[PDB]
Write a protein that binds this ligand. Structure first.
Ligand SMILES: CC(=O)N[C@@H]1[C@@H](O[C@@H]2O[C@@H](C)[C@@H](O)[C@@H](O)[C@@H]2O)[C@H](O[C@@H]2O[C@H](CO)[C@H](O)[C@H](O)[C@H]2O[C@@H]2O[C@@H](C)[C@@H](O)[C@@H](O)[C@@H]2O)[C@@H](CO)O[C@@H]1O
Ligand SMILES: CC(=O)N[C@@H]1[C@@H](O[C@@H]2O[C@@H](C)[C@@H](O)[C@@H](O)[C@@H]2O)[C@H](O[C@@H]2O[C@H](CO)[C@H](O)[C@H](O)[C@H]2O[C@@H]2O[C@@H](C)[C@@H](O)[C@@H](O)[C@@H]2O)[C@@H](CO)O[C@@H]1O
Ligand SMILES: CC(=O)N[C@@H]1[C@@H](O[C@@H]2O[C@@H](C)[C@@H](O)[C@@H](O)[C@@H]2O)[C@H](O[C@@H]2O[C@H](CO)[C@H](O)[C@H](O)[C@H]2O[C@@H]2O[C@@H](C)[C@@H](O)[C@@H](O)[C@@H]2O)[C@@H](CO)O[C@@H]1O
Ligand SMILES: CC(=O)N[C@@H]1[C@@H](O[C@@H]2O[C@@H](C)[C@@H](O)[C@@H](O)[C@@H]2O)[C@H](O[C@@H]2O[C@H](CO)[C@H](O)[C@H](O)[C@H]2O[C@@H]2O[C@@H](C)[C@@H](O)[C@@H](O)[C@@H]2O)[C@@H](CO)O[C@@H]1O
Lengths: 136, 135, 136, 136, 135, 136
């Protein structure tokens, strides 16, 4: 089966200047119905196709996929190659994780954080999705 | 089940200077066999791993996943951080959408458009795919 | 079903300056259980969310998804827009391939190569995965 | 998926002389996890491999598969060919039903009743099962 | 997936005195949608839980599961142990077959025939069903 | 998935006068490929549509579904209602079992045995089958 969540914050863009990972609002998957299922795995894709980061010390952004149990399943990020980008451009980002649903997990969700004091921005479509399948 | 299409225009590169979204030829999924099925869902991924855009005003490219009846299911894109890039680099792009197959939709396809008068280019492997599952 | 492998070589980072494609250590899928299945397809995703490439002639890196018989299923890459990037930044990369399991192939793996004498680097999470399903 | 329940009441056999259908203890399936699924069907099999019915007017037994709302999905029965069987023998019985899970029903169960004042008996293994699958 | 048909001829009982296998009306599965699929298989169950047969020479009935092109996939039946049963009792019957769906077969159906000049009877619920799965 | 085995011993009928359960030749399912799979269940149907038993003390026959580990999953049987049947008739028999494939099982097979010194006979089509499914 498929679980999916998307956002499209054009009118009210999202930003973070947090050095610690914080949730991205709206990018949460409920896997409640599959908790404690030794027979199931989720393949989770976080898609942030058009982020940018503003700043003056090689800005960028980081993203993670995490469970409600606080387990960080995957992480990565983008950064620019100039110290002070002329105008911070859109750097597409995707992240893929796996999670065994054997444990008592109920949520898989997206998080983000800054780097080198940047501000990370999302102002357009983004999604988190999972394909949940039997291990056989 | 999986549905998949790919292109590899290495001997015949694709480009657009269109300000309006237009189809990327060959990146289309025929979902006719699954349509009119309210309990099926598709999770669609557009993968354009090596695009670039030329131009002189912070060039870039935008992409979308659309139905044959013109509903935009997802969109996004890349841009460079310099007004006139020294040599427009390859900026990998992936886009993920979801679509219920309840309607009489027959095709899900990829579209592209330019940014600030750029020309967007694909000259190598790219794909569109879907995983189609019961709810 | 899902097949999955990930690496997180933070303590012992990976790199290549190979002009020719070589395996990325650890990013291999074992599909031998499904070899020669006439009605199964795999959708394979190579996710390298945080690579970079150092060098001084428009550096970058190329990636491919390949079978153990040497068939290249997909390929692509990233490159910077300056000849000599001030400090080569993180350029997220994802690649999707399809593979019919109607084959005696037993392993699918990730490969990489350099561009214009660059060195490509992975020093954090990366994954390769497949969703395997019946064509009907 | 499979849902299953069996009984083996060798030490504490079951019987009924009820003219009206009553539940067979223990032969119930819990389908509440699938309640109100619009695209799922269950193929239900009631297997009573070793029943008999005692009595002196062409005895036998009837069985049904019923929802917790009282809907009879299937029914059938066995009877002997003599008015007064010399010693009522074991007459294997199987019954198959279909059930759409597009319903708020939470339990499917087996029922039994007598014939012509018989007593029906189960003193060994019996089962009720369902295979649950998506219609597509 | 599941395919299923049932009958309940309580107000219009069925019977046969045919020595040759003949169709039981209504116990047929349309497998057209799955045909020409070499990698699909059907597991078919015929369930006739309450049949009986009348007659005076050890009566009984035989059943088969057959394709529309006349291939017999399974067969079996019941009989009484007395030459002239006092009153022909209900003898539950179930039959299970397998069929590859590689061919252009469109129907799998139930058939019946008599034994030693009997008349076979169905006057209540009966079904035919299949579970259809990838190999 | 489906596993299936059938016999049709018209030319060379099968019989047993064993009071202990013995294998029915040819009614064996190989579940090797699913051993040690906590995520899988098998629903197993033994179908002996046309058996009979000869004898002079209420003859009949018993059948079981058993694993290679010697676990008896299900059992049942038929018997006649007269001490000495005029001519032992065909008494259709079906048996349904479930097995969790979490254990190291490789075969599920059919067995039979006599009762009260009878001889059990099969001279026509019979099958054993399983539907194997994810528990979710
Ligand atoms: C202060 C200012 O005018 N800056 C503009 C910048 O616009 C600002 O940021 C955008 C995202 C939006 O919130 C504006 O309201 C805001 O003023 C320009 O950004 C473009 O703005 C247009 C709308 O006018 C679109 O939103 C477009 O997508 C924006 O460009 C994208 O986002 C930028 C931050 C870069 O990543 C660029 O590559 C993208 O295409 C930019 C355009 O060059 O110019 C000034 O900096
Ligand atoms: C050679 C040097 O000192 N340059 C630093 C650089 O650190 C070097 O490279 C990183 C990858 C690591 O191996 C260091 O041991 C090494 O000194 C800085 O890179 C950052 O280093 C910090 C730790 O000090 C973190 O590891 C951080 O993630 C690194 O930045 C990332 O990787 C870089 C190569 C760039 O892609 C950057 O955009 C990333 O965020 C950089 C930081 O600007 O500064 C000097 O160049
Ligand atoms: C009342 C009596 O003594 N009659 C016996 C009968 O035993 C009775 O019924 C069985 C079911 C059990 O509850 C006994 O305690 C009770 O005495 C015999 O039945 C067999 O009994 C043996 C044990 O002694 C086994 O239990 C065996 O499975 C029984 O036969 C089966 O059940 C019968 C009711 C018939 O359906 C028969 O065909 C089965 O095989 C019978 C055996 O012929 O003999 C007296 O009638
Ligand atoms: C010794 C004798 O002639 N007995 C017959 C019996 O035939 C014997 O058993 C059958 C199964 C077969 O192996 C014969 O070669 C053997 O002689 C009759 O059984 C029927 O035989 C015909 C063939 O001539 C068919 O095989 C038919 O299906 C048999 O009847 C079935 O099996 C019986 C054992 C009973 O269960 C009956 O109800 C079945 O229909 C019988 C027929 O009444 O008559 C003599 O007993």
């Amino acid at each position: 089966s498929i679980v999916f969540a998307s956002i499209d914050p054009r009118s009210n863009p999202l930003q973070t200047s947090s050095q610690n990972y914080v949730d991205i609002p709206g990018l949460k998957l409920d896997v409640s119905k599959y908790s404690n299922s030794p027979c199931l795995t989720a393949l989770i894709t976080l898609n942030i196709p058009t982020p940018y980061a503003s700043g003056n010390n090689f800005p960028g952004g980081n993203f993670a996929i995490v469970t409600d149990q606080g387990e960080q399943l995957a992480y990565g990020g983008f950064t620019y190659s100039s110290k002070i980008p002329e105008n911070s451009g859109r750097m597409p980002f995707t992240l893929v994780a796996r999670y065994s649903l054997a444990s008592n997990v109920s949520t898989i969700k997206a998080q983000w954080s800054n780097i080198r004091g940047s501000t990370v921005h999302i102002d357009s479509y983004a999604s988190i999705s999972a394909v949940i399948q039997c291990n056989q």
